[PDB]
Amino acid sequence: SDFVVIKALEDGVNVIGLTRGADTRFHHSEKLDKGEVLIAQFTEHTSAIKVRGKAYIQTRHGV
Amino acid sequence: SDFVVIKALEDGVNVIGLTRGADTRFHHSEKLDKGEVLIAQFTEHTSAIKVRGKAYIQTRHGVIES
Amino acid sequence: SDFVVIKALEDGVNVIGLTRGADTRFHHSEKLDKGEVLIAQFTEHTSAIKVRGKAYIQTRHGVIES
Amino acid sequence: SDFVVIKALEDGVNVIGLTRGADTRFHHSEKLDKGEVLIAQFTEHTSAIKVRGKAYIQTRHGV
Amino acid sequence: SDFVVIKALEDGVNVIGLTRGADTRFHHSEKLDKGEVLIAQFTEHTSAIKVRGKAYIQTRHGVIES
Amino acid sequence: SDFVVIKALEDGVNVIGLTRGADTRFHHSEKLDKGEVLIAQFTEHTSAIKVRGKAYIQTRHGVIES
Amino acid sequence: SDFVVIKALEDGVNVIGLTRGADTRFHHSEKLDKGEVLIAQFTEHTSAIKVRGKAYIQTRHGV
Amino acid sequence: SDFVVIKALEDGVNVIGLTRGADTRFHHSEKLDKGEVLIAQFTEHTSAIKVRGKAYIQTRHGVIES
Amino acid sequence: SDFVVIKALEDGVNVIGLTRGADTRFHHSEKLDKGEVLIAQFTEHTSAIKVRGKAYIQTRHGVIES
Amino acid sequence: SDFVVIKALEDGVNVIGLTRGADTRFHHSEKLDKGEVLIAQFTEHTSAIKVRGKAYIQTRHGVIES
Amino acid sequence: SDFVVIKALEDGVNVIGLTRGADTRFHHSEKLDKGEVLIAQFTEHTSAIKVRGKAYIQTRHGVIES
Amino acid sequence: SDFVVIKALEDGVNVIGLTRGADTRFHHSEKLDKGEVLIAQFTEHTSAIKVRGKAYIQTRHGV
Ligand SMILES: N[C@@H](Cc1c[nH]c2ccccc12)C(=O)O
Ligand SMILES: N[C@@H](Cc1c[nH]c2ccccc12)C(=O)O
Ligand SMILES: N[C@@H](Cc1c[nH]c2ccccc12)C(=O)O
Ligand SMILES: N[C@@H](Cc1c[nH]c2ccccc12)C(=O)O
Numbered sequence: 082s083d084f085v086v087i088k089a090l091e092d093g094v095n096v097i098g099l100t101r102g103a104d105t106r107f108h109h110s111e112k113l114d115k116g117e118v119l120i121a122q123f124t125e126h127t128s129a130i131k132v133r134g135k136a137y138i139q140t141r142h143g144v
Numbered sequence: 145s146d147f148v149v150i151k152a153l154e155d156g157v158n159v160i161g162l163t164r165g166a167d168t169r170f171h172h173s174e175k176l177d178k179g180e181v182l183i184a185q186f187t188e189h190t191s192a193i194k195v196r197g198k199a200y201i202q203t204r205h206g207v208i209e210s
Numbered sequence: 211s212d213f214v215v216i217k218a219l220e221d222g223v224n225v226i227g228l229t230r231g232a233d234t235r236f237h238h239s240e241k242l243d244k245g246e247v248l249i250a251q252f253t254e255h256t257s258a259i260k261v262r263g264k265a266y267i268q269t270r271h272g273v274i275e276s
Numbered sequence: 277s278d279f280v281v282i283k284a285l286e287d288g289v290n291v292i293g294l295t296r297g298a299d300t301r302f303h304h305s306e307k308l309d310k311g312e313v314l315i316a317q318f319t320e321h322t323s324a325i326k327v328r329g330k331a332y333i334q335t336r337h338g339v
Numbered sequence: 340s341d342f343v344v345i346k347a348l349e350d351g352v353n354v355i356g357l358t359r360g361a362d363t364r365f366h367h368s369e370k371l372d373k374g375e376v377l378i379a380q381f382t383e384h385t386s387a388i389k390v391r392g393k394a395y396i397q398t399r400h401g402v403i404e405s
Numbered sequence: 406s407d408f409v410v411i412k413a414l415e416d417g418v419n420v421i422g423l424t425r426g427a428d429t430r431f432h433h434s435e436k437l438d439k440g441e442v443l444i445a446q447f448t449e450h451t452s453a454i455k456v457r458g459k460a461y462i463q464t465r466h467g468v469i470e471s
Numbered sequence: 472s473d474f475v476v477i478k479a480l481e482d483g484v485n486v487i488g489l490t491r492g493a494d495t496r497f498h499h500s501e502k503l504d505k506g507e508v509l510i511a512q513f514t515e516h517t518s519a520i521k522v523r524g525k526a527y528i529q530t531r532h533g534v
Numbered sequence: 535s536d537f538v539v540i541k542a543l544e545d546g547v548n549v550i551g552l553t554r555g556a557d558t559r560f561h562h563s564e565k566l567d568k569g570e571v572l573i574a575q576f577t578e579h580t581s582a583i584k585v586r587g588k589a590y591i592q593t594r595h596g597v598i599e600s
Numbered sequence: 601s602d603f604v605v606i607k608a609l610e611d612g613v614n615v616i617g618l619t620r621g622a623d624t625r626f627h628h629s630e631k632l633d634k635g636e637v638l639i640a641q642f643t644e645h646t647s648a649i650k651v652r653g654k655a656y657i658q659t660r661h662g663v664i665e666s
Numbered sequence: 667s668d669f670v671v672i673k674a675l676e677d678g679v680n681v682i683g684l685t686r687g688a689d690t691r692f693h694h695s696e697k698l699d700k701g702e703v704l705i706a707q708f709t710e711h712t713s714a715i716k717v718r719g720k721a722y723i724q725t726r727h728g729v730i731e732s
Numbered sequence: 733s734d735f736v737v738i739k740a741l742e743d744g745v746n747v748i749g750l751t752r753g754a755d756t757r758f759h760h761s762e763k764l765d766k767g768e769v770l771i772a773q774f775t776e777h778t779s780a781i782k783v784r785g786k787a788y789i790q791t792r793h794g795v796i797e798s
Numbered sequence: 799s800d801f802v803v804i805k806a807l808e809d810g811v812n813v814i815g816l817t818r819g820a821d822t823r824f825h826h827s828e829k830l831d832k833g834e835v836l837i838a839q840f841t842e843h844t845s846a847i848k849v850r851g852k853a854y855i856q857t858r859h860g861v
């Protein structure tokens with residue numbers, strides 16, 4: 082499945098997973114400190130991801 | 145599944161999901177402040193996405209930057 | 211599924227979904243004001259999409275702008 | 277499924293859908309005024325499309 | 340499904356569908372006047388297409404222009 | 406399915422379908438006069454196609470003209 | 472399915488289909504006169520094709 | 535399945551697997567000392583991977599180093 | 601299915617099919633005189649092909665010419 | 667299935683398989699002396715691979731050489 | 733299925749099939765004299781192929797000659 | 799299925815097949831003398847291959 086790479090460029094970057102389904106709420110926010118990397122898939126439970134905070138982001142489409 | 149990347153270029157950007165099915169209504173609006181990024185799929189419940197406000201948008205087709 | 215990207219180049223653009231099946235009528239018209247973007251799939255209910263008004267459009271086939 | 281993009285270059289362009297099946301008749305003609313765009317798929321009901329009137333047309337094969 | 344694009348370069352162009360199956364007969368002829376375009380699929384009922392008259396033809400294989 | 410494009414370069418070209426199966430005979434010959442085009446698939450009933458007469462032919466493998 | 476294009480460069484070119492199965496015999500030979508073209512698939516009944524006589528031949532691999 | 539390559543550029547790098555499903559918690563942290571490499575898949579149990587510490591990382595999307 | 605093209609560069613070329621299965625024996629030898637061409641598939645009954653004599657051979661991997 | 671190539675650039679290289687499933691433990695360590703090569707798949711039992719020691723590593727993503 | 737092309741560069745080359753399954757033994761050795769070619773698949777019965785003697789070999793991975 | 803090409807550059811190269819499953823042991827070692835080539839697949843029984851001895855090796859990833 083499709084996935085996103087997020088590298089935090091400041092402390093306190095929040096990678097926010099939004100619920101798949103008729104309803105949309107955040108079910109999880111993963112905090113990254115500067116330099117940390119999250120590689121996160123879309124899944125049965127997560128159909129949108131929001132990134133709040135300065136970050137270098139890669140997807141299938143580019144940076 | 146296909147997905148869209150939206151980066152807000154100003155405060156107050158709204159990304160709106162439109163319901164899949166015979167009927168079409170807004171089911172969710174996600175607000176983005178300047179520099180926030182939303183990576184959103186098309187899904188069982190969302191078959192169209194509307195973006196209001198200055199934004200950099202990427203899909204499989206390429207890029208559109210306000 | 212195949213999808214279309216529509217960016218309105220003026221106020222009051224309309225993106226219209228036409229019904230899939232033996233019958234063909236408009237089932238929804240989404241209005242876009244200048245700079246607003248709609249990313250819209252073909253679906254179980256929508257098998258043709260009509261754009262009225264000055265728009266920049268992207269599909270798998272390329273770009274069409276004015 | 278395969279689809280066609282039609283941009284009308286004059287008023288009154290007719291995008292004509294022909295019935296899939298043993299019989300061939302038009303079941304729908306969608307009129308486009310100048311500058312309007314139709315993006316239309318081939319479907320269970322439509323296996324040929326005729327465009328009458330000046331138009332810029334894109335398919336999988338080109339313009 | 341595979342499809343052919345035919346643009347008439349003169350009046351009186353005919354695009355003819357030949358029946359799929361053990362037997363081969365013309366089942367439909369669509370007339371095109373100069374500049375009209377037909378985009379036609381191969382289908383359950385059509386396994387060959389004949390074009391008579393001056394025409395620009397595109398398939399997956401490339402182009403043939405009268 | 407695989408298909409062949411045949412453009413007649415003279416009058417009286419024949420495009421012949423040979424039967425699929427343990428037996429092989431001609432089941433149809435389509436005549437093409439100069440400039441006429443046939444786009445013909447391989448099918449449940451046709452597993453070889455013979456072209457007689459000066460023709461420009463395109464397949465997935467390329468072009469063959471004279 | 473895979474197919475071969477044979478263009479005869481002399482009269483009397485024979486395109487020979489060999490039987491698919493435990494046994495190998497020719498079941499059909501299609502004669503081509505000079506300039507004639509056969510486009511022939513591999514099939515349930517034909518798993519090898521022999522061409523006897525001067526011919527220009529195209530397959531998936533080239534000429 | 536998709537996989538990530540992580541090379542530690544300092545001692546004490548941690549590669550953390552986050553649980554797949556409605557709940558999200560860390561289920562494993564693998565420590566890597568300088569020069570050590572982990573090649574890790576996404577799996578039935580792991581749907582996000584977090585890297586803490588200076589690392590060179592490769593995925594299908596490219597490289598990310600520091 | 602994968603296939604091999606063999607063109608004989610001299611008289612007396614033999615193309616030999618080896619049986620698919622636990623046992624391996626020659627089940628057929630086709631003779632080619634100079635300039636004759638055999639296009640042969642791998643099949644339910646043939647899992648290896650041996651060519652003896654000067655020949656030009658093409659497969660998916662490329663060409664070998666004696 | 668995806669696989670990794672590891673060539674040891676010094677003696678004492680260890681390639682360690684980590685168990686697939688809810689739990690993560692080392693299930694095997696293969697030692698490589700200088701110049702030995704291991705080509706290892708991801709499998710029903712192995713969903714992550716750890717390499718300790720100076721090594722040249724190749725995956726689908728590219729190469730990492732100590 | 734994957735296949736290998738072997739051209740003998742000297743007399744007495746042997747192409748050996750090793751058995752697929754829990755056990756591994758030689759089930760067939762095909763002798764090739766200089767210039768002879770074997771095109772051999774991997775199969776239900778053969779999961780490794782050994783070549784002894786000076787040979788030019790082609791696989792999906794490229795060429796190996798001497 | 800994926801496969802490896804091994805060409806021995808010395809006598810006594812050992813191409814070692816490791817068992818697929820929860821347990822990892824070698825089930826077979828195929829010896830190659832200098833110049834001999836083994837082309838070996840991954841299989842139901844073999845999920846890792848170790849090559850001991852100087853060898854030129856090709857896989858899907860390169861040499
Ligand atoms: N348990 C979550 C983990 C996750 C994956 N991608 C994410 C993106 C953001 C937040 C959490 C996640 C899930 O399987 O969906
Ligand atoms: N709950 C929504 C989440 C979502 C995905 N893509 C979106 C685009 C816009 C708004 C919401 C969404 C869904 O699964 O469909
Ligand atoms: N409810 C509509 C939403 C939609 C998708 N694409 C469209 C194009 C135009 C208008 C509406 C739509 C549907 O699922 O079909
Ligand atoms: N109801 C029609 C809509 C349509 C799709 N493509 C068309 C082309 C021309 C005219 C109408 C159409 C159908 O589903 O087939």
Ligand SMILES: N[C@@H](Cc1c[nH]c2ccccc12)C(=O)O
Pocket residue numbers: 294295296297298299300301323324354355356357367368369379380381382383384385388
């Ligand atoms: N009713 C015809 C329509 C058609 C498709 N392709 C054609 C080509 C020529 C003539 C008619 C057609 C069919 O479904 O087969």
Ligand SMILES: N[C@@H](Cc1c[nH]c2ccccc12)C(=O)O
Pocket residue numbers: 357358359360361362363364386387420421422423433434435445446447448449450451454
């Ligand atoms: N009825 C024929 C039509 C046909 C297709 N390809 C052909 C080539 C030659 C002659 C006839 C045909 C069929 O379905 O097979």
Ligand SMILES: N[C@@H](Cc1c[nH]c2ccccc12)C(=O)O
Pocket residue numbers: 423424425426427428429430452453486487488489499500501511512513514515516517520
């Ligand atoms: N009836 C034969 C026709 C054929 C196809 N390819 C051929 C090649 C050579 C000779 C005959 C054929 C078959 O279906 O197999």
Ligand SMILES: N[C@@H](Cc1c[nH]c2ccccc12)C(=O)O
Pocket residue numbers: 489490491492493494495496518519615616617618628629630640641642643644645646649
């Ligand atoms: N009857 C043989 C025909 C054949 C195909 N490929 C071959 C190669 C060599 C010799 C014979 C053949 C078979 O189906 O297998």
Ligand SMILES: N[C@@H](Cc1c[nH]c2ccccc12)C(=O)O
Pocket residue numbers: 549550551552562563564574575576577578579580583684685686687688689690691713714
């Ligand atoms: N037992 C874990 C192993 C694993 C794979 N990828 C990981 C990434 C991080 C931590 C552990 C892992 C699993 O199968 O999911």
Ligand SMILES: N[C@@H](Cc1c[nH]c2ccccc12)C(=O)O
Pocket residue numbers: 618619620621622623624625647648747748749750760761762772773774775776777778781
């Ligand atoms: N009967 C053997 C034939 C074979 C195919 N590839 C080989 C390689 C070497 C030796 C024999 C073979 C089989 O089907 O497996």
Ligand SMILES: N[C@@H](Cc1c[nH]c2ccccc12)C(=O)O
Pocket residue numbers: 750751752753754755756757779780813814815816826827828838839840841842843844847
């Ligand atoms: N019988 C073994 C043969 C084999 C294939 N690849 C190997 C690699 C190394 C050693 C033996 C093998 C198997 O099918 O798995």
Ligand SMILES: N[C@@H](Cc1c[nH]c2ccccc12)C(=O)O
Pocket residue numbers: 681682683684694695696706707708709710711712715816817818819820821822823845846
């Ligand atoms: N028995 C192990 C063999 C293995 C494959 N890849 C590995 C990587 C590291 C260690 C062991 C392995 C398995 O099938 O999973």
